[PDB]
Symmetry: C5
Subunit: 205 residues, 5 copies
Amino acid sequence: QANLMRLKSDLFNRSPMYPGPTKDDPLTVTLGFTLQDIVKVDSSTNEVDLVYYEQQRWKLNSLMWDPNEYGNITDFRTSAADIWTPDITAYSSTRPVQVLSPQIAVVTHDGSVMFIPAQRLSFMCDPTGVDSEEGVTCAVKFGSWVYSGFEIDLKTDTDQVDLSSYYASSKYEILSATQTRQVQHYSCCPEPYIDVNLVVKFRER
Amino acid sequence: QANLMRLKSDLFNRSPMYPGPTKDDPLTVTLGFTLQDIVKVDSSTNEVDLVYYEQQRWKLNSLMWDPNEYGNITDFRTSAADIWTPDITAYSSTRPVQVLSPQIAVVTHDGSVMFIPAQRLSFMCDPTGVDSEEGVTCAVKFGSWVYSGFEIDLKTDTDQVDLSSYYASSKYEILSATQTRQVQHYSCCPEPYIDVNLVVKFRER
Amino acid sequence: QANLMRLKSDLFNRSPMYPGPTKDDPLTVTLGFTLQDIVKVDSSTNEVDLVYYEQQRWKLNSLMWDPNEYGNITDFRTSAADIWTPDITAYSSTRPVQVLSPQIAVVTHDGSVMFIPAQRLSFMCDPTGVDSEEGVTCAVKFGSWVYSGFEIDLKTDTDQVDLSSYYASSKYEILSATQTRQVQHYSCCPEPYIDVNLVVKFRER
Amino acid sequence: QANLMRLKSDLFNRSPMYPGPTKDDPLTVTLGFTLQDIVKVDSSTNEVDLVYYEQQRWKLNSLMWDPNEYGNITDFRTSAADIWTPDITAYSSTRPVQVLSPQIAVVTHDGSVMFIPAQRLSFMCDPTGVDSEEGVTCAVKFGSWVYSGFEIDLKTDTDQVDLSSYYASSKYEILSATQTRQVQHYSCCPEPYIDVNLVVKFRER
Amino acid sequence: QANLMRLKSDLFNRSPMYPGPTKDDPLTVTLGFTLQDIVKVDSSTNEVDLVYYEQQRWKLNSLMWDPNEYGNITDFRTSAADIWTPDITAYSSTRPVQVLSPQIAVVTHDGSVMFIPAQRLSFMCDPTGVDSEEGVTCAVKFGSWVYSGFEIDLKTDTDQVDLSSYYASSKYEILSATQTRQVQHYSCCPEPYIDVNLVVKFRER
Ligand SMILES: c1ccc(C2CCN(CCc3cc4ccccc4[nH]3)CC2)cc1
Ligand SMILES: c1ccc(C2CCN(CCc3cc4ccccc4[nH]3)CC2)cc1
Ligand SMILES: c1ccc(C2CCN(CCc3cc4ccccc4[nH]3)CC2)cc1
Ligand SMILES: c1ccc(C2CCN(CCc3cc4ccccc4[nH]3)CC2)cc1
Ligand SMILES: c1ccc(C2CCN(CCc3cc4ccccc4[nH]3)CC2)cc1
């Protein structure tokens, strides 16, 4: 406990918190989705409710340490409030996202951070054809709300959504689930915009 | 990181926070709406739910800096809690507004602030005739709750609501969406009152 | 900005906050209601939902200042959290009251405070007869939760509820709306209890 | 104001807050209920919703003062957050309790505290027979969550629930409402467990 | 009070809070469930709502004291916010868990902590066959969100869920309720992961 108390004190009480990335010091954020369930489909409002884990990874030099100086500690768990976290948001939500898991991150000695919030999301989705064999496709983009591709570079490790934890007795069957990194440019702005498009093809089980 | 940490420290930890505008030092707030969806229409209570982005822009001398003194930083992102924000509100909401995005603003070296909260709004709207070709018109005024025209001047860049992000498979089709700055004079009071009237004409797709 | 920053610092950072009134130093609170809408009526639970502005006015010697000493500032806007506010409550609510507006007050150099929260209230009301020409009458009392008339004296400027902002396409038509100051004494206790009785007669439009 | 500011400073800023009772220094908490309304009955989930005032009284030596030393102040009102409050809870609630009133307590010079929160409670109750003349009986136990009878001596003043404020046009009529205290010892443990069983017999009006 | 004030000050104001367990200093957390009611079953979304008490026990050397040095105090009650608590979560919830009880723990002089939060949980469960004699089986895993078996060792005192407080007039009858410790391994990671699988077999009463 003494070595970990010392490490946390040196990392969090000595210097001000990381102020976020800039064009000169960009940050790469890796996103991955683990879809657990399609909990609700509302055909009268065109809202669909998903339960998923959103894996977020990034690396900060300010979070690095030599394990030899701290009783061979290679990683620790800490409240996500103690650290800077990226402002990754769903771009077409209809309700505030509901957090289903403790807000705790894992920090590794190389400065790597892994934060996996479990969430319930209501987003814009026309479910017409969900009761058919072909099913229905719905998509929701995720990205930084305030940082462009010049400050936050969004990435995925795979374009395949993790369906290994998908509820087997769900009302809905997943035909396909992909997470695709997209780089967009708008007429307004010279900076690129990055999002991860979560595309889910599903039908009634 | 060091230059941004220094900038934020100089802007936020040296002087007290901006106390808001006065008649002697008025502030101009530019409002713009990006309508995403008409998520719900309730004909039994006369409530309509909107999902939109509300772009807010203002400029403070106290937020200015010389980029040359701070490693050529021309702008940064910071929690909206670190800065003063205008008390812009819907004058005919029926439920507290639901924030759908991170509460983060972009501050530019010229003292400009851009704050774009995504919101879900429930407001007073009689949807009689939504199921017709003519559709229905509904309006909601936005403005400062406590500041008159003498302290906060409200403006728009365009009278046209941005409909380029409007949900393509929405239950409702937008016939027209305008955002108009209105000035109101009362016999009682010498001070003018300013609002932005969001007028949306819509029908069932 | 500098003069207002100085004023706020002198009023709020020099002395402890106003500890509320006492029998020796009573406070008069003026109440006024502006009814915007009867949003929902529930005949299965006997609950009615109102949307209104509740104007609250009081005066504190501790909030007084000479405008000449502060660059001729005669009033300012401040977060209601910076000041003491009366504990005015609805005595027959069925749900926690929902705040629809920014929590900001206007302080005048004579020590006057004006606080106008917009609220959504669910209260006990049998709506039987709302669908008739005669309509239905419903009442809700407002007053201090913990202070008697010896500490907080409630007053009204008028017995007429402001209906000039009442939603013209509401499901309900207002036949009459009054706000009356009422006094009561209990056998135990000598102190009077004050409430403002909001009586609304309404029917379906 | 000055004398009350001085009193509050002496009571709350000089010594640490009361750490709660112990076996060596037990505390008597007097509990009583004022039933306002049976708002809802749900026969599909077996949940009943009550609106009531829960009167809590206790006395602390650390909250005592000589009125002569403080401008003859015999009592004051303060935020329930400034003082220790007992952890009295419903043992069979189905939803978090909703607070309908300001969280303010009355402290008397003898160290007496009176705290009367208004609340909405959903609790386990089978309402089968509510639509009959006989009605239905439902019960909810209240007590300390973590303190035994050795630390918190939970008491009542009367076994009769105050029905003098019960909503006259409620959907439900009260046939009887009692608050019976119970002291129990289990074979495991030497300490008594105390609870108050709020028993309400009611039917449709 | 003085001895307890002194004890709390020595335990909580002298050293930094316990930073959580590590591989070198693991922690055993014992979990136990007391099922109170199956409040709701939703066959359209496949969600079931449970009301239960979750007993959590763990032991910290940093929470030890000699009762002889503190007026023979052998245990005390304190806000769960004053101490470190394990991040035990339901792995298949569909809504944020609702806390129904005060967040207070019991600390014993041997460093033992007992924390029993009452909760309402919505979780993934297909209730098809609940209206039959055979009933339906539903399961929910609980475990640490961020810690492995190397840091938090989860244990049970019994595999039998406590049904002695189960609501007698519930819509649902419990056929069986077990809580089983399970050790899992993931392809990513060499460390074992522990969960407690709450398996409830139930039917309509
Ligand atoms: C966040 C944290 C834990 C989980 C777990 C899922 C399965 N195990 C743990 C299995 C587990 C996943 C996992 C994902 C990335 C890296 C390491 C990981 N270990 C218990 C909780 C889910 C989301
Ligand atoms: C309001 C409007 C769009 C957004 C974005 C939605 C898609 N992108 C990039 C699209 C985008 C245009 C744009 C115009 C002005 C300022 C920021 C902007 N971001 C990232 C955030 C956030 C808030
Ligand atoms: C609380 C509740 C509602 C408001 C206003 C409602 C409509 N207007 C301006 C309408 C308005 C005239 C007027 C005349 C004298 C004093 C205050 C006044 N407000 C802007 C906001 C402000 C604060
Ligand atoms: C708890 C319970 C009710 C209230 C009130 C609701 C109606 N009154 C009546 C207030 C009131 C009666 C009374 C009778 C005997 C002794 C003290 C009393 N206070 C003012 C506030 C406030 C706090
Ligand atoms: C967590 C879970 C339940 C409770 C209680 C439920 C019922 N009682 C009596 C609680 C109670 C019996 C009992 C019997 C033997 C040993 C210890 C015991 N505690 C008071 C609160 C408190 C905290």
